Design a protein around this ligand. Structure first.
Ligand SMILES: O=c1ccn([C@@H]2O[C@H](COP(=O)(O)OP(=O)(O)O[C@H]3O[C@H](CO)[C@H](O)[C@H](O)[C@H]3O)[C@@H](O)[C@H]2O)c(=O)[nH]1
Ligand SMILES: O=c1ccn([C@@H]2O[C@H](COP(=O)(O)OP(=O)(O)O[C@H]3O[C@H](CO)[C@H](O)[C@H](O)[C@H]3O)[C@@H](O)[C@H]2O)c(=O)[nH]1
Ligand SMILES: O=c1ccn([C@@H]2O[C@H](COP(=O)(O)OP(=O)(O)O)[C@@H](O)[C@H]2O)c(=O)[nH]1
Ligand SMILES: [Ca+2]
Ligand SMILES: [Ca+2]
Ligand SMILES: [Cl-]
Ligand SMILES: [Cl-]
Ligand SMILES: [Cl-]
Ligand SMILES: [Cl-]
Ligand SMILES: [Cl-]
Ligand SMILES: [Cl-]
Ligand SMILES: [Mn+2]
Ligand code: NA
Lengths: 537, 521
């Protein structure tokens, strides 16, 4: 006579949301798809001080999901829409700290009063991609445990050290934990943003988000107060990094903007789509339509091989997320060309070239890569495009890419700089000393020896200069042909074949675009280096 | 870095209490629930009362007012009118409308427990006395989905069946008596448990249990405990009963045409059964039971023989008599062991020549002497005061249910019929059981007394007291439980009766017996 399985533990998900409408469709979409039984899950949502339609998005989602969960608590407040003592929407004044602390205490009291086993705090911009995160956190059997969320930088939802006054302290252990070099659940003095409290443990009764502990003497900060509360309760905060759990945006400054926040979370979605499928939104919420543009450029090109469908879709998704429209140029497959078609185009390798690394001659793929860029150069001159931006099909976008690239071009044109080529993504080779800065143009340098063609801006003058050199009779890899044309290539023999090397080439500083996969990374694809010489099979 | 985790809090249990016409039992029943050794912050109360002819809701609300702050939550669902079901024949009749309402109530408590995320729901009938404060913990420890504690009763009845007739009817199996008697201890799979039981709402199969409506496949009678039992079978939830130790007591259900007073006295007998081997079940700190006032049951006097060194027997008997509203005159027993031979000779006491123990052939003991002298002094007092009818008690006896009413009705019938009587056994050891004792015509529940072997309790008339004294039994001392059978000429040893010339005692016995011994040696 067997006893049935136990039901899953009872969890209350507590969600405080202020100015989160940009993130809720994806964040709430992740939460609703958690692999934890919904009848064993309850929802506690509090929103207030919203300058956007956060209240409406939450209400639309709650009405659609209410009948699926154990219970829903909904605490909206439409007015006021900003704190009276705030300096901005991203400023954390004492009134904001006190209110947030009281909300988490209210959510904790709710979880206790409803006899829940756990309360799960998730910040409205924290994306829990792993549906097993809640189950995994429960399995660790801790009183307070947080999953380590990834960010674009070293930031994460934990500290490895804390001073005697509650300030952050960096320890050597932080980096290996952050990079998942050491995997496990580590005792840390601080966790926040997303963490799990075990309300079955007797010691959890002594935890409080508000008021501060009677012996508290530190700053009126919400996460420090709770950390000190676990200290007095003798409750050890833990962070677990045993696998990927989710992603979170790096917090902004007090004087930042709501657009900075919205674009920052968009970068989280971009970072997810680097090595994961896109994080889908909730099927009960619709994100607002986006209007793509060309960022003021005359044209935006995207070189993509017709067979690389995965790259095309990832790039088209990334560009649509950033409201950027491109012209999809079908790349020239160098492997598909036979020797006769190469001769039909009159293509001859530069006499004596060898790969700077393994010494192999020009490959068929490198030939096609050069031809695709060359064809875009012709189209720039044919259409008379003053400024055009060229993309490859495997690049990772930096945060605030669109605004930062538009601001750079605006500064370039305002100073009347005579430019031919502007690197957006490259491999800088002169690293012993900084490259020469461009006067009166911030974030721009004179390009020294470089070695990539991920992304760049090209002028009509610069397009003519490349075609004028007629590189087809002396073809090099395009990422080496350019440093020849602005006279930075180390091999003097290569530059000797090119009589005029007057190209004006610059680079963004810091770079705005990096490769998605590097050599040796899982999934790295280099159709240029397919070990196939251009001359013949 | 090892860091210990604090203990887990106790499981969260909702105690569901349905109360109708239960004011007589609540002060003791609710007091037992208070003192359950389980954290009250992990306990919730669900109480529903309705169709009350007594002050049940008043008693309940005063108790809840006094304990509300100690519990996780309290739900209160009273309904003053109507005070009786429109289809009921009486307050103890289980009509279909009463069955339906009680099923819906238990379903409401079950839904309430699920909605508050309790671990367990414990049902306790308002008349069930959970004397063992660890009962809740022990039931949780068995890790069953539906488990009930075997509560004790005055009879074979308990809160469980061992067999079922595939049509919902009760069925007797050979395993019932061993479980009921605690000859076999443990937790046993059974087709039916009721009254007080514990449901484990952590188990996945508990989601399919339902008190109402009946399961779609239900084809049996509209009975509440059958419907829930069938719900467990369809959910593949095995019902269990545990008897590993004593947990509590419950009255035996009455008949449809019984009265509220019948129920009140029935639960009072439950308290008597508790006091046999336990201290009296204490009431609530906040509820007081109504004061009782004892009488002499219409007798001219009620005696109770007790030796002063037997303080426990004295206190237990007085508690038993007070509960039954019976007042008595305490008579200090003669301690025959303390009597020296000089005091024995001063009273002219001589054993009946040739007496031998019917089981060990031993002479008359000093203890039997003192016991005889105790009854002898009462007979003497009966004749001095002229008491027409007196009731005589010893100090180690267990009372039957409805004792007071059952004895007073017999005496009324005896007087109505003008029966000439000297001795009426209220408790004895019937030795002639091969053929039935001759019934007394026109007097119900009374028979002619044949050979008997005890003197636990008897009614004696002034005429009867005169006859016993006239025999001069001190010169022919014989155990009192044998001297009486000699006097109504039913003693087997004709040589013993030869020493007594006149043996004209009119003896009768109540049938069935209203008083039995406690240890029943
Ligand atoms: O008035 C408010 C203020 C904030 N929030 C909510 O509180 C969470 C945190 O707000 P932010 O997303 O702006 O937080 P940051 O990215 O700036 O980093 C945060 O990291 C910790 C998270 O616990 C602390 O809350 C810290 O104060 C805070 O800066 C969010 O779910 C937000 O929606 C509200 O609901 N109402
Ligand atoms: O209208 C009503 C009728 C009954 N009850 C309650 O339900 C329980 C039934 O106990 P009773 O003493 O009144 O009835 P029984 O002694 O006959 O014992 C009962 O034991 C089972 C308990 O599961 C079933 O209720 C069954 O119908 C019945 O025999 C009690 O707690 C009673 O207070 C109510 O609350 N409201
Ligand atoms: O024969 C080829 C191979 C690639 N490409 C394109 O040129 C760029 C080179 O990217 P890839 O990652 O394949 O080469 P690598 O970055 O390794 O030099 C991409 O836009 C490709 O679509 C091309 O035009 N012809
Ligand atoms: Ca945030
Ligand atoms: Ca009952
Ligand atoms: Cl709602
Ligand atoms: Cl990093
Ligand atoms: Cl920090
Ligand atoms: Cl009848
Ligand atoms: Cl009738
Ligand atoms: Cl009848
Ligand atoms: Mn590449
Ligand atoms: Na009748």
């Amino acid at each position: 006579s067997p006893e049935s399985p136990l039901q899953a533990p009872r969890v209350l998900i507590a969600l405080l949301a202020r100015n989160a409408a940009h993130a809720l469709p994806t964040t709430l979409g992740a939460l609703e798809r958690l692999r934890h039984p919904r009848e064993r899950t309850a929802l506690w949502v509090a929103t207030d001080h919203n300058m956007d339609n956060t209240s409406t998005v939450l209400r639309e989602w709650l009405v659609a999901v209410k009948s699926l969960y154990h219970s829903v608590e909904w605490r909206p407040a439409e007015e006021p829409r900003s704190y009276p003592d705030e300096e901005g929407p991203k400023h954390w004044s004492d009134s904001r700290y006190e209110h947030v602390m009281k909300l988490r205490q209210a959510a904790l009291k709710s979880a206790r009063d409803m006899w829940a086993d756990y309360i799960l705090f998730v910040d409205a911009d924290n994306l829990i991609l792993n549906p097993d995160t809640l189950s995994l956190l429960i399995a660790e059997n801790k009183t307070v445990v947080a999953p380590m969320l990834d960010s674009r930088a070293a930031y994460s939802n934990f500290w490895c050290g804390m001073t005697s006054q509650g300030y952050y302290k960096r320890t050597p252990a932080y980096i290996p934990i952050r990079k998942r070099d050491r995997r496990g659940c580590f005792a840390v003095p601080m966790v926040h943003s997303t963490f799990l409290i075990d309300l079955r443990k007797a010691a959890s009764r002594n935890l409080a988000f508000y008021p501060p502990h009677p012996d508290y003497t530190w700053s009126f900060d919400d996460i420090i107060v709770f950390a000190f509360s676990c200290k007095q309760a003798e409750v050890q905060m833990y962070v677990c990094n045993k696998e990927e759990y989710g992603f979170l945006p790096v917090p902004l400054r007090a004087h930042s903007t709501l657009q900075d926040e919205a674009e920052s979370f968009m970068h989280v979605q971009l970072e997810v789509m680097v090595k994961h499928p896109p994080a889908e939104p909730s099927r009960f919420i619709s994100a607002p339509t986006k209007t793509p543009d060309k960022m003021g450029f005359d044209e935006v090109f995207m070189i993509n091989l017709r067979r690389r469908q995965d790259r095309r879709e990832r790039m088209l998704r990334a560009l649509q997320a950033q409201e950027i429209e491109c012209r999809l140029v079908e790349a020239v497959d160098g492997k598909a060309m036979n020797t006769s078609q190469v001769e039909a185009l009159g293509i001859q390798m530069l006499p004596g070239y060898r790969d700077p690394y393994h010494g192999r001659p020009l490959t068929k793929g490198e030939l096609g890569c050069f031809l695709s860029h060359y064809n875009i150069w012709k189209e720039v001159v044919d259409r008379g495009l003053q400024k055009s931006l060229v993309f490859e099909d495997d690049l990772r976008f930096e945060i605030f890419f669109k605004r930062r690239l538009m601001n750079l071009m605006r500064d370039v044109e305002r100073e009347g700089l005579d430019w031919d080529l502007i690197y957006v993504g490259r491999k800088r080779m002169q690293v012993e000393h900084p490259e020469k800065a461009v006067p009166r143009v911030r974030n721009l340098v004179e390009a020294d020896y470089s070695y990539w063609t991920l992304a760049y801006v090209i002028s009509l003058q610069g397009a003519r200069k490349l075609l004028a050199a007629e590189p087809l009779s002396k073809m090099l890899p395009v990422d080496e042909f350019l440093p020849v044309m602005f006279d930075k290539h180390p091999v003097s023999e290569y530059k000797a074949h090119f009589s005029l090397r007057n190209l004006h080439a610059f680079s963004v500083e810091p770079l705005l675009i990096y490769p998605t996969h590097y050599t040796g990374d899982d999934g790295y694809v280099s159709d240029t280096e397919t070990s196939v010489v251009w001359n013949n099979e």
